[PDB]
């Protein structure tokens, strides 16, 4: 028995039922209502609106698995789940293309300053000289993290003629070569790159992966994209690089603190940003419905 | 041997001219008055967009034989007045194509994810997630009108995103277009299929208002439109009315029937993103156009 408590694609319920599970769909429930529905349930599927708090988890006696049809666990008390022996699942594949597409958009925006040009036009200005940009053809793109999103960015930007190099400690040079990315050690990467984009998880080993030492090994006027997680690019180092001109531009979808209380990066003229929109598409939201229902049916 | 450069060009342009054995004067920004005086002893003028080579100027410039534009088209040159006085006109139809294609693709992505709007919101100190829901390009259909230099480069880039690419061009066979992945159909069958449409034609009487009230009404509700070609191909009044009703969900404009535009309604619309005619505005394209036009002059 599974409860679906948020508004999901009807393609989730079907698969569950084909797997041999009983389903109940229903949203916008109160705490009390939610706990009552769960009384006979070993499975719950949410997206963002349903708040799977310690209080709900502790009152739901038969529950063994909670699925979120998104990335992260923002609306789930992961710790209370673990005290109770409940497994928490996510959908590591459903968001990949939306995030890769944003990344590529960010790259193009940094080459040509579209978002600053738009702001200028809307202020009534006509600023030709100011927004002289860069042609991507023949430029080198460094891709750090060559998993699901990394390789999708690579084949897209190869169609603009960009040379794609990268680094990933787990993906073989043979696998990367099949999507046209030549692997090298980090220290050989930095000096080659006109653009660098990051697609790694956030771990102790990736916290400040770009920092003051790595920025000094980059080409003068490098442009940087972070559509992964806040913290992979050290934010103080990035502002220093933007102040000196070592970094000519940055695009940020994510921040160490969200919303970010320090505004100096966001306010810089050469920085473009979004409020963590990498998974913010109808299509990504729906693939996630399928992805999580299918894991539950395998379970 | 004397040639004036009257607009701001890549410094490779004069260099080469000088290597050819010509004297050069770079004096961008000049009144009708100042320009005619500079030309008095010149047989060559190279412009970009700001200098207006009018019938007036041409008729006062006694010793001129050749005018070069470091761009496409001849928008700031009176070609009928040059030809009457027997003057040949030069332009650079190749140097800019990839920069224009790249901007076009940037514009498509910006419209799908509202990147310029989201940046403005962030810089206004807000965190507005809910509000910036977007569209994934994969599996969407892109209409491409004009399948020459730029149209075909746009096609191959956007095919890498999984967009289905359809289009129309009166000169390119359906066999040729199919070899770069574009399926040619009559215009009337294109309009209803498209999630995005982008134009890449010259401005001609047949392309003036190629999108208009009648064609917008045959489009899918919520179509998104890009004009990185010339102002006027998309009828501006028809566009604003399509944005107002929701028939068009979004537009991106790099060019205007008047530049800079005095009517601000399109530019001010929340679902419109725009630039000040930046399609050729990259160091590399300006360097190539500079070279392209100087080389023609040295050959003369
Ligand atoms: N912006 C958004 O809203 C959004 C949406 C989806 C995913 N993401 C994020 O984007 C990132 C990438 O996701 P993915 O699905 O491609 O992940 P993945 O797990 O498929 O691949 C990640 C890769 O990162 C590599 N990596 C780890 N440490 C590294 C290092 N030190 N140097 C180089 N590479 C290293 C791993 O070897 C792995 O191959 C994640 O942080 C994810 O949370 C963000
Ligand atoms: N900065 C900028 O924004 C920028 C820069 C360069 C060029 N441009 C413009 O973009 C446009 C295309 O440039 P190009 O080099 O790609 O031109 P091109 O000559 O290589 O191609 C133009 C194509 O449009 C086609 N065409 C003609 N009539 C048509 C119709 N009625 N419907 C559909 N297609 C039609 C022609 O058959 C031709 O193949 C031009 O208007 C050019 O001036 C803009």
Residue numbers in the entry:
A (entry chain B): 8 to 306
B (entry chain A): 7 to 306
What does the primary publication say about this deposited structure?
PHGDH diverts the glycolytic flux towards producing serine, which in turn is metabolized and incorporated into a variety of biomolecules including glycine, thereby providing a major source of one-carbon units for the synthesis of purine and pyrimidine nucleotides.
Here, in order to better understand the substrate and catalytic promiscuity of human PHGDH and to identify other potential roles of PHGDH that might be relevant in diseases, such as cancer, we have developed and applied functional and binding assays for PHGDH, and have solved structures for the catalytic domain in complex with its cofactor NAD+ both alone and together with the substrate analogue L-tartrate. In agreement with the deposited structure of sPHGDH, two molecules were present in the crystallographic asymmetric unit (ASU). In both domains, NAD+ was bound in the same way, forming various hydrogen bonds with the enzyme. In order to characterize the movement, the two molecules in the ASU were compared using the DynDom webserver.
